[PDB]
Enzyme design. Sequence first.
Site, PDB file in Angstrom:
ATOM      1  N   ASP B  33       0.783  -1.233   0.000  1.00 37.50           N
ATOM      2  CA  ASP B  33       0.000   0.000   0.000  1.00 37.50           C
ATOM      3  C   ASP B  33       0.819   1.289   0.000  1.00 37.50           C
ATOM      4  O   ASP B  33       0.346   2.320   0.479  1.00 37.50           O
ATOM      5  CB  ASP B  33      -0.940   0.009   1.207  1.00 37.50           C
ATOM      6  CG  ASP B  33      -0.190  -0.040   2.526  1.00 37.50           C
ATOM      7  OD1 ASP B  33       0.635  -0.962   2.701  1.00 37.50           O
ATOM      8  OD2 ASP B  33      -0.421   0.840   3.386  1.00 37.50           O
ATOM      9  N   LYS B 146      -6.389  -0.261   6.647  1.00 33.70           N
ATOM     10  CA  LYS B 146      -5.198  -0.022   7.432  1.00 33.70           C
ATOM     11  C   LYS B 146      -5.046   1.482   7.582  1.00 33.70           C
ATOM     12  O   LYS B 146      -5.380   2.242   6.675  1.00 33.70           O
ATOM     13  CB  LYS B 146      -3.958  -0.591   6.740  1.00 33.70           C
ATOM     14  CG  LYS B 146      -2.775  -0.733   7.687  1.00 33.70           C
ATOM     15  CD  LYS B 146      -1.453  -0.479   6.980  1.00 33.70           C
ATOM     16  CE  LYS B 146      -1.337   0.970   6.560  1.00 33.70           C
ATOM     17  NZ  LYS B 146       0.033   1.293   6.087  1.00 33.70           N
ATOM     18  N   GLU B 187      -2.667   0.476  13.411  1.00 35.44           N
ATOM     19  CA  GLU B 187      -1.210   0.545  13.365  1.00 35.44           C
ATOM     20  C   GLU B 187      -0.590   1.722  14.112  1.00 35.44           C
ATOM     21  O   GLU B 187      -0.484   2.824  13.578  1.00 35.44           O
ATOM     22  CB  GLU B 187      -0.711   0.576  11.911  1.00 35.44           C
ATOM     23  CG  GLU B 187       0.810   0.469  11.818  1.00 35.44           C
ATOM     24  CD  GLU B 187       1.348   0.595  10.404  1.00 35.44           C
ATOM     25  OE1 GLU B 187       0.558   0.471   9.442  1.00 35.44           O
ATOM     26  OE2 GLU B 187       2.573   0.811  10.258  1.00 35.44           O
ATOM     27  N   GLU B 189       2.587   2.703  15.013  1.00 36.91           N
ATOM     28  CA  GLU B 189       4.009   2.439  14.882  1.00 36.91           C
ATOM     29  C   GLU B 189       4.948   3.337  15.668  1.00 36.91           C
ATOM     30  O   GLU B 189       4.889   4.563  15.572  1.00 36.91           O
ATOM     31  CB  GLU B 189       4.453   2.476  13.417  1.00 36.91           C
ATOM     32  CG  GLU B 189       5.851   1.898  13.244  1.00 36.91           C
ATOM     33  CD  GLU B 189       6.470   2.153  11.877  1.00 36.91           C
ATOM     34  OE1 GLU B 189       5.726   2.275  10.881  1.00 36.91           O
ATOM     35  OE2 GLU B 189       7.717   2.212  11.806  1.00 36.91           O
ATOM     36  N   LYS B 229      -1.233  -3.917  14.284  1.00 43.59           N
ATOM     37  CA  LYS B 229      -0.008  -3.883  13.490  1.00 43.59           C
ATOM     38  C   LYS B 229       1.001  -3.013  14.233  1.00 43.59           C
ATOM     39  O   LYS B 229       1.209  -1.838  13.909  1.00 43.59           O
ATOM     40  CB  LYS B 229      -0.284  -3.317  12.095  1.00 43.59           C
ATOM     41  CG  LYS B 229       0.963  -3.186  11.245  1.00 43.59           C
ATOM     42  CD  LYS B 229       0.625  -3.081   9.768  1.00 43.59           C
ATOM     43  CE  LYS B 229       1.893  -2.964   8.932  1.00 43.59           C
ATOM     44  NZ  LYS B 229       1.585  -3.048   7.481  1.00 43.59           N
ATOM     45  N   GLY B 273      12.049  -1.550   8.622  1.00 38.24           N
ATOM     46  CA  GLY B 273      13.432  -1.323   8.247  1.00 38.24           C
ATOM     47  C   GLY B 273      14.354  -2.507   8.497  1.00 38.24           C
ATOM     48  O   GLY B 273      15.516  -2.475   8.100  1.00 38.24           O
ATOM     49  N   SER B 300       3.025  -8.552   8.406  1.00 37.58           N
ATOM     50  CA  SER B 300       2.343  -7.589   7.554  1.00 37.58           C
ATOM     51  C   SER B 300       3.521  -6.750   7.091  1.00 37.58           C
ATOM     52  O   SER B 300       3.694  -5.600   7.510  1.00 37.58           O
ATOM     53  CB  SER B 300       1.358  -6.728   8.342  1.00 37.58           C
ATOM     54  OG  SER B 300       0.725  -5.804   7.473  1.00 37.58           O
ATOM     55  N   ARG B 303       8.415  -3.591   3.284  1.00 34.92           N
ATOM     56  CA  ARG B 303       9.795  -3.678   2.814  1.00 34.92           C
ATOM     57  C   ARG B 303      10.425  -5.072   2.917  1.00 34.92           C
ATOM     58  O   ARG B 303      11.122  -5.513   2.000  1.00 34.92           O
ATOM     59  CB  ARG B 303      10.664  -2.665   3.573  1.00 34.92           C
ATOM     60  CG  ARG B 303      10.448  -1.205   3.156  1.00 34.92           C
ATOM     61  CD  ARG B 303      11.077  -0.208   4.142  1.00 34.92           C
ATOM     62  NE  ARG B 303      10.311  -0.095   5.383  1.00 34.92           N
ATOM     63  CZ  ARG B 303      10.639   0.698   6.403  1.00 34.92           C
ATOM     64  NH1 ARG B 303      11.728   1.459   6.342  1.00 34.92           N
ATOM     65  NH2 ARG B 303       9.875   0.736   7.486  1.00 34.92           N
ATOM     66  N   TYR B 363       4.640   6.723   3.960  1.00 32.20           N
ATOM     67  CA  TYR B 363       4.064   6.063   2.792  1.00 32.20           C
ATOM     68  C   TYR B 363       2.555   5.929   2.922  1.00 32.20           C
ATOM     69  O   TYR B 363       1.937   5.437   1.957  1.00 32.20           O
ATOM     70  CB  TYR B 363       4.669   4.668   2.601  1.00 32.20           C
ATOM     71  CG  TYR B 363       4.173   3.643   3.589  1.00 32.20           C
ATOM     72  CD1 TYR B 363       4.712   3.557   4.874  1.00 32.20           C
ATOM     73  CD2 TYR B 363       3.136   2.770   3.246  1.00 32.20           C
ATOM     74  CE1 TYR B 363       4.227   2.622   5.794  1.00 32.20           C
ATOM     75  CE2 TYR B 363       2.647   1.840   4.155  1.00 32.20           C
ATOM     76  CZ  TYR B 363       3.194   1.770   5.424  1.00 32.20           C
ATOM     77  OH  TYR B 363       2.693   0.847   6.312  1.00 32.20           O
TER      78      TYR B 363
END
Lengths: 354, 363, 351
Positions: B33, B146, B187, B189, B229, B273, B300, B303, B363
């Site tokens: 996504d 998401k 999510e 993060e 997530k 990462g 999920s 990268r 992103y």
Amino acid sequence: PHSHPALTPEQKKELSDIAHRIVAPGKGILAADESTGSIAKRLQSIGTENTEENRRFYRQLLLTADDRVNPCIGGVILFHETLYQKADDGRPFPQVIKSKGGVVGIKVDKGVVPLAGTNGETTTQGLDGLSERCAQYKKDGADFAKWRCVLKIGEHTPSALAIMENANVLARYASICQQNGIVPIVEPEILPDGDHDLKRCQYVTEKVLAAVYKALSDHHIYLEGTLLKPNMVTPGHACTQKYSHEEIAMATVTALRRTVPPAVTGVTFLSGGQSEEEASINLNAINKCPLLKPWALTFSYGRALQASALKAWGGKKENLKAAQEEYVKRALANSLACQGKYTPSGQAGSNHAY
Amino acid sequence: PHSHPALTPEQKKELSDIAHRIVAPGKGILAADESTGSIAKRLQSIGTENTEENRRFYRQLLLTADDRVNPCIGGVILFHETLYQKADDGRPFPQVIKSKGGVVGIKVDKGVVPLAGTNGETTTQGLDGLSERCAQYKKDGADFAKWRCVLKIGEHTPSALAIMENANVLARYASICQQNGIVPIVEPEILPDGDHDLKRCQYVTEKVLAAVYKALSDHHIYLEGTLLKPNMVTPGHACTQKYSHEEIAMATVTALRRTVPPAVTGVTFLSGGQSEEEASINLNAINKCPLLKPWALTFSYGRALQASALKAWGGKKENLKAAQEEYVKRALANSLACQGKYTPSGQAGAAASESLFISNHAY
Amino acid sequence: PHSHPALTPEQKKELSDIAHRIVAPGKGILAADESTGSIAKRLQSIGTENTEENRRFYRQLLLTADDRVNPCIGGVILFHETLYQKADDGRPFPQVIKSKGGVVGIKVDKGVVPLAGTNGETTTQGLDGLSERCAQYKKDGADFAKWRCVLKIGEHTPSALAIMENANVLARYASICQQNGIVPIVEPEILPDGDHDLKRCQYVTEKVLAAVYKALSDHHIYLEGTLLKPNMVTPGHACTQKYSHEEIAMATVTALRRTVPPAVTGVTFLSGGQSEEEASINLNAINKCPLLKPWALTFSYGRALQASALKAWGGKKENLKAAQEEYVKRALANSLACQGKYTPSISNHAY
């Protein structure tokens, strides 16, 4: 526990000066920011096709009223559309307002949305890309904005969630506005709908405003650079018990003294259904209340300022002067009310149980 | 103190069934996504120019890999554009995903925005008209969504405000999604950016998740119809001290056991990462951690599932099969890892061992 | 955003080990921490003068029941008075309890107090000097404590204030306890009084528990070193609608799965006035409920374990054996119940 200044001394100064100009002694706000949805009801009430030209002509009617309204109107709230329309003479409406001494305001929220899991309660959307919109609006003439949240008194409302969520969204909105030189008018309206009595509204208003200001505090909002647009504390529309304007005023002022920090520059009440005269009388009563009021107590009326003008116009161009006369009168009557000098005459003139 | 049911029993069943399908045993999520401006940097890193066709081709390259990924991929997250794109055979991408047993997901946040009064902290926007968008996406094949909030560990961050605000917006997002039959993936993060150690990250993670679930409760969120997530608990990217995979797994599972209610159908970790191999080894360790874990612990990855693929593609059509093979291999590895059955070899390549770190990943 | 270790690894290990021993498989808690005024009604129902001696004898009677209760009792909650009394042979009660494989608990709250501005809601007091008291109780044989908060389901209750304040005081009590090597049992009791149905109770239990755990997080509580003593999710006493034990079990386990972090070492349900039989049958049903339960699901019963024993006793020493047999029987029944193996004599989205 560490400060990270959201605003510089210059940015604060600008926001404070604007807020003060909007609520200078004897001045109030003209709420002419009805969206195409509510303006449809207005035009229909007088049998007038809701076309853009008609909307322009109508807004032009209020904005170009004679200089008598100048000392009465500190600010005018416009809907996106109107902010870019021009008067017959080719002058942008924002320029019209400015040259008459009024500050230009713009409605930036995108309506209420239903809050799942509640009994018909809502929150308000409109934060997406708000920063870019404010930057544009500022450049295009606006100096303050308007965001409306709606709360309702019921058997289970305002619920904890609704109070918290609405208070939080208002803070976010205020935060983004100040970053763009726009004074945010925080409007946490508690509908008058219902059969609850006066002390029920005062209770709810007190709890709602406390949450609002704690929220603004958490989001580092500069209060001197903001305005508050609350409901006056009144009994429910369907309430069987009756009260006097002195009682409504005492309840109103009391609820505000208990929650609104003195740093807040001004309170611009919403009329929420009250008649033109009712809104003026109540406003006058509020300013005459024998209690210490550390902030300006004025108006931000829509229908309480346009009702008669709208009907006198009837969509007929030949009624322009008649329609403007009606508006002018309400502007003058409310100008006196926000100074406590109002009388049916005209220009010529406990608390422990709360 | 009064319940005003947000969801009917039928609505709950649909959300619960959807959430479980996505994280069924051995299955994970492919995070494709990336926004147009983000994917552009990816194609740019391989001498490929960012064009609608290139983006389409690449996504097709991933979505149409051989049937071996079917057991590995429970769901695929797509960006708005990709969701409405088609494969060479004329089939809409969502249709392709379903034919391979995968659930179609859609990213609905509109990026982060700065929070005034904080030290570089942000919150995320995207709520405006979200309800209508969810109804449309649902009609167009999406079953889950998401939303990404970003927090950072620093001297004064994450701050009280940042944590509260991000938890509240996630809750609003989750509330709207479930009203439209869409499973929201929450999510929150916590970036690895910084030189903090493992315990610093564990502490922050526990606070963030505690805040996240209190907000979700406040907003009447049906946990069984959601997925989490989070970041795995690891030391800062610039941390000097070293830790084993067992330690990262212990800190991660401990942090989760202390904050995530058993009702949560599953946890789908972001790679953040970490190298493709490093992401697989940790997920494997997490699933092998000797503690009780009442929720599926899977992947999920964005990268961590495309590093080798992109490099093998290089933007040349003839490398299609080669690129897909690298994708399938990572998906297979991760499929085992989320079952604690992954044992490294030596064929992943230098690409899978390369650091995929990106400061303030957007992103 | 910076951690300031409330506890050392050693302290965590101690609290964690204590917590686990109390709710080990098949084990439960005997709640015998009734105060002088709370026990007054019991003794009265059996024409027994409320004297320290009779209270000592009654407690002796329960604590010295035969070894059959040993694998059934992981912990016993005592009232201050009792913690300092001895059995006839001279053994202090804490020693007796420990010799039988049980952990000694102590009630530390000082009762509920009215919350002004509310519809008869309360909060609980007892934090003053609690640290000094815990250190002393720990030294005197206690390893865990009990603090009870009460909430009621009504028209406007439990209110936001009640919920928030009770959650906060519970967190303070837990914090102080853990600093003194005492495992705190968090008890946010939602009374069964009223005519509300099962859904109403489940909803309130979920909101209350969510508030409790956020407060615990805010106060930096080590969850592994704590236990939860909640009400089972049931309909109100005056509820006309009826439910099966499988339904209340489903509602109970569902509410807990949605709010209690897996890190919590155990859940010791309060009897809340249910009969000895009803409490056992419900716990059994709770344990057989086909849902994933990441924490021990056992008991912490008062009258649910004493009712028949008290009547059999009747204040007559010659009734010692009969009375103990009753307690022992309920201890056996509940031990089997927390294992889902007691007999009276798939995830459902409807919750």
